[PDB]
Amino acid sequence: NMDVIGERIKRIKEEHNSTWHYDDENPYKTWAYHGSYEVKATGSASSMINGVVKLLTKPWDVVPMVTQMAMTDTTPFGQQRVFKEKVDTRTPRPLPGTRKVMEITAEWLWRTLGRNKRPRLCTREEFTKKVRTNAADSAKAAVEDEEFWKLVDRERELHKLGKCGSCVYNMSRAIWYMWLGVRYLEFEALGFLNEDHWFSRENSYSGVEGEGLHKLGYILRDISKIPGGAMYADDTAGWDTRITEDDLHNEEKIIQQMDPEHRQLANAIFKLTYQNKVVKVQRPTPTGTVMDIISRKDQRGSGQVGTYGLNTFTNMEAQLVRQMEGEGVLTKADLENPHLLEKKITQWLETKGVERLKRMAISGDDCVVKPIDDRFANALLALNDMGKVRKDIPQWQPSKGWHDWQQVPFCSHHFHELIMKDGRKLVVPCRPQDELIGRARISQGAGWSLRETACLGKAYAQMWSLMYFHRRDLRLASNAICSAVPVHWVPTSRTTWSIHAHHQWMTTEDMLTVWNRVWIEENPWMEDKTPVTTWENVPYLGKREDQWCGSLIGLTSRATWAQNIPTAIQQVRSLIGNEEFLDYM
Ligand SMILES: COc1cc(C)c(C(=O)NS(C)(=O)=O)cc1-c1ccc(C#CCO)s1
Ligand SMILES: [Zn+2]
Ligand SMILES: [Zn+2]
């Protein structure tokens, strides 16, 4: 193993030869531990609170989920316990018949995914444009420095030789340049999966990449029209820790479709940074804080360019295998059999594969599957054996599916079908309201002025006006925030890092105009393009559904908040100062 990871550990060991030691009280059980060095502790035990959002959501000061969200421990202590609880495990090797079906399905799926698209290298200028559009950080400064690109070039020359010197995953500007450089090289070799939308629904059938939260419910409703059994949406317990050596070798098959110069760099990423990895994690000790240097051959590195796409790929494969078991194509005897008949798998993929992909909505580890019947509920042999054990349910207990697409969980949301006052139907995204309020009350970092805090508050308010307008409390709080924040101040930072977010709320354009563009003009499931001219015609969930999804409507404290909200708005305005404000109430 040292022939692939040895150089990286050697450079770390040499840079910290003063404090480098082999701490034999290290807690690693499934990861190879190489050594430790002294570091300055980073992170926080609590998240910073957005005062503008907090002042305008007084009834949620007394809400447990809202309080919990504001916690989140990122200190070496928090790092260590998350590591222990999840990441320090070993997934049993799938059986030989299971490995054979996975291999056949992976080959077929990669061929299907690359039927129209050809892989390509991503560039310095693409990465630069992405970093700049995200910053609008020291990454924009690094990208502007020529010396960063020279370090990138030197690392790439090692990769071309089948060597790695500085690509270390993290759980001086040199170590920052080496981190950003590692990320650029991964983007260079595997970025095409995202940049050329390989997991778009048109290209992958099951995929939803590029679709947007506002489209996911409509796609779930379209899946519900397909004849078959219930809709299943099982959660995997820590998916990234369940990515096996066999999954990694199956994902690597995409290199067969690459040009020689591309294949060489992508092979370097796979072999040196995915199938082998050097990881840095902080750990508190009685003497202070230390950085541990660890390594392993499997699992997925969560904060990587290829993670979403490769998790989507492996989940599509795993769900097709489960569909085959449900249909009787794969038996218990087949999974144990190294010599299992490849022909029946090939025949099922070639005749039914695409139709079975159309029965799914897959986004990374998130899946919704509508099998041909309910035999799928009990088809658990391959799923458990591939290592994709379902979260909080005994291993052999049948899955529970839904016969209403509106009850189906997907991507931390569920979706409602609303009837507008004019008779038109809308499909809207929704989640427990406490989660929406709790998240909006969290500020992103310390040393933030009232202006930056208010502008992030406005971003949350405008996201609610666009995606969660159907929640009575959120429309009211959104109107309150936008009345409290100067009209000409541009929303800043980001409300989410979700791939399903297109950030149409990041504007000073009228929110009703943005609402019409997204929900009416651009909406392919909205045949009638008649605009909505007033928010009074922008619908709400039925009051009982709003309440079932966490609304405080009907409570006295909520009525008291709604009545007194001009007072709280005025208090925010007075502390912001003499600026131009508008009355949205
Ligand atoms: C599936 O969508 C999401 C999934 C998750 C888990 C989270 C989240 O909680 N993010 S977080 C941890 O607060 O950063 C956020 C969203 C989105 C919010 C708004 C969106 C939009 C749009 C249309 O353009 S998409
Ligand atoms: Zn490297
Ligand atoms: Zn709901």
From Swiss-Prot:
Coiled coil: none annotated. Residues 1-585 are cytoplasmic. Zn(2+) 2 binds at H414, C430, C549. It is a peripheral membrane protein. It is found in: Host endoplasmic reticulum membrane; Host nucleus. Zn(2+) 1 binds at E155, H159, C164, C167. Sumoylation of RNA-directed RNA polymerase NS5 increases NS5 protein stability allowing proper viral RNA replication. It catalyses: a 5'-end (5'-triphosphoguanosine)-ribonucleoside in mRNA + S-adenosyl-L-methionine = a 5'-end (N(7)-methyl 5'-triphosphoguanosine)-ribonucleoside in mRNA + S-adenosyl-L-homocysteine; a 5'-end (N(7)-methyl 5'-triphosphoguanosine)-ribonucleoside in mRNA + S-adenosyl-L-methionine = a 5'-end (N(7)-methyl 5'-triphosphoguanosine)-(2'-O-methyl-ribonucleoside) in mRNA + S-adenosyl-L-homocysteine + H(+). Homodimer. Interacts with host STAT2; this interaction inhibits the phosphorylation of the latter, and, when all viral proteins are present (polyprotein), targets STAT2 for degradation. Interacts with serine protease NS3. Replicates the viral (+) and (-) RNA genome, and performs the capping of genomes in the cytoplasm. Besides its role in RNA genome replication, also prevents the establishment of cellular antiviral state by blocking the interferon-alpha/beta (IFN-alpha/beta) signaling pathway. Inhibits host TYK2 and STAT2 phosphorylation, thereby preventing activation of JAK-STAT signaling pathway. This is RNA-directed RNA polymerase NS5. It comes from Dengue virus type 3 (strain Sri Lanka/1266/2000). The chain holds residues 2762 to 3373 of 3390 of the full protein.
